[PDB]
């Protein structure tokens, strides 16, 4: 339901004390690309866990090679991260033609740089967004980016370290059909084993 959000705006859903099945879900998914790291394709539809976390976002196939864990692209720099502490799965899918419940946003986008300067206007340090974490650039970058290289800026309070936070975003136009991406991470002992 609704419009999928940007890759730097990844919506997370957590599942606990319930039952799941991909065959009732993945059948209506036009899965373009299917990868899983530290886990088998059959495990996510067969094995039992303690809890599930699934992050979904809008993601085209143009920056497909940036799905790698060790990739250093801006998507893997200031937009989305993956946890080294748990096995992961990556899904790249497309809206089915006989599926109009979902909606399409204006354009794909991501953040090409996210670094913070200090009050002295001479020292600049990039911040590294952590695994399953959100950069402070998310707090100032809007949900959509109007055009490639859009610039955003904000003043930071001295109690928050002072200086300024600046960022720039880049855009990729829509294809014939909307493409989106999902990341799946499992948890085995983080609570009662019930899923």
């Amino acid at each position: 339901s609704g419009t999928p959000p940007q890759v730097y705006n990844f919506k997370r859903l957590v599942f606990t004390n319930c039952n799941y099945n991909l065959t009732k879900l993945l059948s209506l998914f036009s899965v373009n690309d299917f990868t899983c790291s530290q886990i088998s394709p059959a495990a996510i539809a067969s094995n039992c866990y303690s809890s599930l976390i699934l992050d979904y976002f809008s993601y085209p196939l143009s920056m497909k090679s940036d799905l790698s864990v060790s990739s250093a692209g801006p998507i893997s720099q200031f937009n989305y991260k993956q946890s080294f502490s748990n096995p992961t799965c990556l899904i790249l899918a497309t809206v089915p033609h006989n599926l109009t419940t979902i909606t399409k946003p204006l354009k794909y986008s991501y953040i090409n740089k996210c670094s913070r300067l200090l009050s002295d206007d001479r020292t600049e340090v990039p911040q590294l967004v952590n695994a399953n974490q959100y950069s402070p650039c998310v707090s100032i970058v809007p949900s959509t980016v109007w055009e490639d290289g859009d610039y955003y800026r904000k003043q930071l309070s001295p109690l928050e370290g002072g200086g300024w936070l600046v960022a720039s975003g880049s855009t990729v136009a829509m294809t014939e059909q909307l493409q989106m991406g999902f990341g799946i991470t499992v948890q085995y002992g983080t609570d009662t084993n019930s899923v």
């Binding site: 530290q38 088998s40 394709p41 495990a43």
Partner: protein, 49 residues
């Protein structure tokens, strides 16, 4: 001497939970959660340890 024998046997009885960098300790769980070409490496790490 009795404690020496006890700790000598407890070295075996305790070490089986070690992973040696493998993602899990149970061999059945490794072959359940993984494809062959990487569970071979994980099992090999367990074998070496």
């Amino acid at each position: 001497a009795v404690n020496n024998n006890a700790q000598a046997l407890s070295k075996l009885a305790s070490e089986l939970s070690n992973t040696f960098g493998a993602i899990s300790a149970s061999i059945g769980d490794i072959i359940q959660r993984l494809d062959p070409p990487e569970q071979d490496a994980q099992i090999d790490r367990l074998i070496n340890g």
